[PDB]
Structure 1
Amino acid sequence: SERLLDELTLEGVARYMQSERCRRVICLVGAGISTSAGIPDFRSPSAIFEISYFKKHPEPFFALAKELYPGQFKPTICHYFMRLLKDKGLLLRCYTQNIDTLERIAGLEQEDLVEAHGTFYTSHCVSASCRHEYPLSWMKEKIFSEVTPKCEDCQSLVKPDIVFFGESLPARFFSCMQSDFLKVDLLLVMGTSLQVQPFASLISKAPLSTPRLLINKEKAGQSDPFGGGMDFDSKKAYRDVAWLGECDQGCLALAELLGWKKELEDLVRREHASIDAQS
């Protein structure tokens, strides 16, 4: 298809973003954008999460949650860059594979977000006739005092709104995909190796002309020899660009090219201070 980037660089993406053509940005994000906040990637080595088992034995999962509880919920530069996109009126949607709620704390609203694997921000009574919603504050303590969270109305198990193995993907994902990718002018992929399906396939739902920027420590999204993946390096490459390093440093570099660096700096400092104060 046609070429909208004058150059396959971050500078070329920055100019396209500043041009009249780029109105609607979609962000595809994973564990990589949350590693610098102190949230470990579950897909990295650096049954318990099966739904049938959890309802029978919830203690192991809540014990693991009690242990791997992060200590402080502070969103990174990459999270506040997406809040800047929203402020500038460029954010169509953020598709996240994370469950750490850092997107919402950075100031992305529920309608801005497609949480492909759910979120800890909200919890629900597992009883269909009740489904009493409990916040993260209520859940924290219940995990803290090692007192299994039970519904105050019906005494059923209270589960955080994350998608365990065996659970179906949020219908929101498929419905939003069908609508969002008819409109997207830029695909901003950050902190994901694009190995988990069907999230990885979202990149092929971009129109042929839609530029796609990967900000990651290593390259990813390329078609596996073992329809159309990421093509950065080949002679046919026309729209796909890769920036290699910390997601935070990459977003900071893009913001710098866009003239947002001070606004981003001031936002991250202001919000980090606010969180530090009440934590």
Structure 2
Amino acid sequence: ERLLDELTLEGVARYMQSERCRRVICLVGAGISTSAGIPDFRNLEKYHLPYPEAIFEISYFKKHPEPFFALAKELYPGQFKPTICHYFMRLLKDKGLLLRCYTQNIDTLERIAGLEQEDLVEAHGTFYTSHCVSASCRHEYPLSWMKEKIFSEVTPKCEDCQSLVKPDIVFFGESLPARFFSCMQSDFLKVDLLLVMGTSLQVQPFASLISKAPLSTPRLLINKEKAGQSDPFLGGMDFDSKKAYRDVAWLGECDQGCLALAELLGWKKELEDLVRREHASIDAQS
């Protein structure tokens, strides 16, 4: 009947290494990056905002961009070092198992860890690239350029047309990337396993993704807290009813959950070597 022989991390690992599991979708949130110690970008009383969310609203940003860039200077991380979880997804990619990583995070660490544009759906956008806001220009700028402008407390302007340059975060008043919908429509016909890591599945439409899986597809949650179950008040996760058949919860730090799964898979040495090498490379940036 069920694809998992037991509703445990061991059952998920056995399934992963079976021929039945070829395509894994990761859905990830802030919990996969808390170990990276990046200031959580998403005090303002001094900017006299007409409403708090104005600092992340596109029309306000075009009127008064300075509050946003002052906050971006304040919360700029000391380093962009991905976690064990990010490199676990890079390993999935290397093993030929990663169909897609859908991320709610804007902190760029998926890209730093080696997931390429085709591997990623950055559902809330990213700080990694920025664009001129003029529709007829849209000149793209990389992270180093913006950092130079931001720490100079110079408002970034396009070299071609002098319009504002905005990081590719999805602001209020903007729609989700069209890539989110096109990839969703195709990927969930193809998925054999959902790995849900470091998200509490509370923000829409990202949460609704778990209900797009085929009914047989196992879903592993690696998270500090159980999440994604149907809300007694309001296709949810069923970990614990006697009808549970495919959903597994591993509760702890996301790094430790990924370590435990890698150990079951025989990947712990590969993962350790990857993380140590990449961290050393980032630490050695001269």
TM-score (norm: length of structure 1): 0.97
> Offset of 1:52 from its aligned partner?
1.1
Is the CA contact (8 Å cut-off) linking 1:185 and 1:211 kept in structure 2?
Answer: yes
> Offset of 1:226 from its aligned partner?
1.6
- Segments of structure 2 that go 5 or more residues without pairing to the other structure are 44-51
Identity of aligned residues (%): 99
Is the CA contact (8 Å cut-off) linking 1:97 and 1:115 kept in structure 2?
Answer: yes
Is the CA contact (8 Å cut-off) linking 2:38 and 2:79 kept in structure 1?
Answer: no
> Offset of 1:39 from its aligned partner?
2.1
> Offset of 1:42 from its aligned partner?
5.6
Q: Return the alpha-carbon distance in structure 1 between the equivalents of residues 199 and 133 of structure 2.
A: 31
SS in 2 for 1:48: helix
Q: Deviations over 1:6-64 (max 9, x none)?
A: 00000000000000000000000000001100124467999211111111011001000
Q: Deviations over 1:118-161 (max 9, x none)?
A: 01111001011111100001001111100000011111100011
Is the CA contact (8 Å cut-off) linking 2:133 and 2:165 kept in structure 1?
Answer: yes
Please give the root-mean-square deviation of Cα atoms over the aligned residues, in Å. Answer: 2.0
Q: Return the alpha-carbon distance in structure 1 between the equivalents of residues 179 and 156 of structure 2.
A: 27
Q: Which residue of 2 aligns with 1:227?
A: 234
Q: Return the alpha-carbon distance in structure 2 between the equivalents of residues 225 and 140 of structure 1.
A: 45
- Segments of structure 1 that go 5 or more residues without pairing to the other structure are none
Is the CA contact (8 Å cut-off) linking 1:48 and 1:54 kept in structure 2?
Answer: yes
Q: Which residue of 2 aligns with 1:270?
A: 277
Is the CA contact (8 Å cut-off) linking 1:31 and 1:40 kept in structure 2?
Answer: no
Q: Deviations over 1:46-84 (max 9, x none)?
A: 921111111101100100010010110000000000000
Q: Which residue of 1 aligns with 2:30?
A: 31
Q: Return the alpha-carbon distance in structure 2 between the equivalents of residues 224 and 208 of structure 1.
A: 19
Is the CA contact (8 Å cut-off) linking 1:27 and 1:188 kept in structure 2?
Answer: yes
Is the CA contact (8 Å cut-off) linking 1:116 and 1:199 kept in structure 2?
Answer: yes
Q: Against the structure 1 CA distance between its residues 277 and 158, is the aligned structure 2 distance closer, same or farther, given a 3 Å change threshold?
A: same
Q: Which residue of 2 aligns with 1:57?
A: 64
Q: Deviations over 1:221-277 (max 9, x none)?
A: 001122910000110000000000000000000000000000000000000000000
Q: Return the alpha-carbon distance in structure 2 between the equivalents of residues 47 and 149 of structure 1.
A: 19
Q: Return the alpha-carbon distance in structure 2 between the equivalents of residues 47 and 259 of structure 1.
A: 48
1:82 aligns with 2:83: no
Aligned residues: 278
> Offset of 1:209 from its aligned partner?
0.2
TM-score (norm: length of structure 2): 0.95
Q: Which residue of 2 aligns with 1:205?
A: 212
Q: Return the alpha-carbon distance in structure 2 between the equivalents of residues 98 and 87 of structure 1.
A: 22
> Offset of 1:109 from its aligned partner?
0.2
Mean Cα deviation higher: 82-91 or 43-52: 43-52
